[PDB]
Amino acid sequence: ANPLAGKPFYVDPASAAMVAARNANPPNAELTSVANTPQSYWLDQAFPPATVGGTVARYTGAAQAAGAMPVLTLYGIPHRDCGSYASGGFATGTDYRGWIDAVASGLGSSPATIIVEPDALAMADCLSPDQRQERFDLVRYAVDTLTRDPAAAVYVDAGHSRWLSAEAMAARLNDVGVGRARGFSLNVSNFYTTDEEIGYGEAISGLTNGSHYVIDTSRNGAGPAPDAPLNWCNPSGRALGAPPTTATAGAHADAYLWIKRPGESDGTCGRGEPQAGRFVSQYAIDLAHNAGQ
Ligand SMILES: OC[C@H]1CNC[C@@H](O)[C@@H]1O[C@@H]1O[C@H](CO)[C@@H](O)[C@H](O)[C@H]1O
Ligand SMILES: OC[C@H]1CNC[C@@H](O)[C@@H]1O[C@@H]1O[C@H](CO)[C@@H](O)[C@H](O)[C@H]1O
Known part of the structure; x- marks a missing residue:
């Protein structure tokens, strides 16, 4: 069955969008709309192995207290973003494995949706063959370890319809034990149409023994x-896309989610724009305005 069906997705009360919406004087309809939409909660190397377990238990516990499904995004892979606008992640594979262990400890048996490492498999060719294999092994470690929470619905990130081919990405997904996970994620922090991503997802599903997927519709309207x-x-x-739902148009599409958070910068981007992740009220307003809100 679809593990995402049956409760609403958790709205993060402490998102930068919520802060901005509550601070708007006068209240701004675009910030409010965005702030009130469930979005994934991103964890990286700012949350060390020593304490991330507690952070994770707190968030999934709070989501459960709201009768809602939390979505968490794991974004700590070594050589993250291949040293580009979103450079970061843990220094080594040993650190990463310790981090995954702590995340799993904080999950326990609690309901959660986990997006594993946006871009890691899709961008991996920037690494040497040995470092690429290490990366695949770390993603596999995430799948093997996080799925011990029976109530964690785990989706390995798989890029998008204009990155690797369905055949090439399926190979990498199969390399990392996608069969043990619920499946994969698409369009994270990108803008391709839901229709396009469904066709790509159904093609990957066929090459991965009928795996399921989610599509990031945060900015693809x-x-x-x-x-x-x-x-x-x-x-x-660009415009906000479909609000998060399990009422999808794909046979193996478990959900449309907002994985990327609308308003958060993608990076300096060659134009001296804010650092990747920093909330820009103007960007959230633009995305909402372009959706007619
Ligand atoms: O070489 C990386 C390119 C290849 N073409 C597609 C393009 O998406 C990709 O860039 C990455 O795009 C994702 C969002 O889809 C970003 O998260 C990455 O930072 C970026 O390098
Ligand atoms: O998609 C992953 C990265 C790199 N390319 C696109 C960019 O928007 C994204 O940046 C991350 O965005 C999340 C969600 O807004 C932040 O939590 C991260 O700090 C940031 O690196």
């Missing part, structure tokens, strides 16, 4: 900007 290098890096003219 108007499709992508014209094809160009960095068209994913704070593009203008």
Whole structure:
């Protein structure tokens, strides 16, 4: 059965969007709309192995107290973002494994949806063959360890319909034991249409023994900007996409989710824009305004 069906997705009360919406004087309809929409909660190397367990227990416990399904995004892979706008992650594979153990300890038996490492498999060719294998082994470690929470619905990140081919990504997913997870995620922090991502997802599902997937619809309401290098890096003219739901149009699509948080910068992007992750009220307002809100 679809593990995401049956409770609402958790709205994070402490998101930067919530802070901005509560501070708006006068109240701003675009910030409010965004702030009130459930979005994934991202963890990285700012949450060390020593304490991330508690952080995770707190968030899933709070979601359970709200009768809601929390979505967490794990974004701590070594050589994260290949040293680009979102450089970071843990220094070593040993650190990463310790981090995953602590995350799993904080999950316990609690309900959670886990997006495992946006871009890691799709961007891995920036690494040497040995470092790439190490990376695949770490993602597999995440799947093997996190799925010990029976109530964790785990989706390995699989890029998007214009990155690797369905065949190439399926190979990497199969390398990391996607069969043991619920499946994979698509379009994270990107802008491709839901229709496009469904066709790509159904193709990958066919190559991964009928695995299921989720699509990030946070910013895909108007499709992508014209094809160009960095068209994913704070593009203008984009719109909020479908609000999070399990009422999808794909046979193996468990949900549309907002994985990326609308308003949070993609990076400096060659234009001296805010650091990746920093909330920009203007960007959230633009995304909402472009969706007609
Ligand atoms: O070489 C990386 C490119 C390849 N083409 C597609 C493009 O998406 C990709 O860039 C990455 O895009 C994702 C969002 O889809 C970002 O999260 C990455 O930072 C970026 O490098
Ligand atoms: O998609 C992963 C990265 C790199 N490319 C796109 C960019 O928007 C994204 O940045 C991350 O965004 C999340 C959610 O807004 C933040 O929590 C991270 O700090 C940031 O690196």
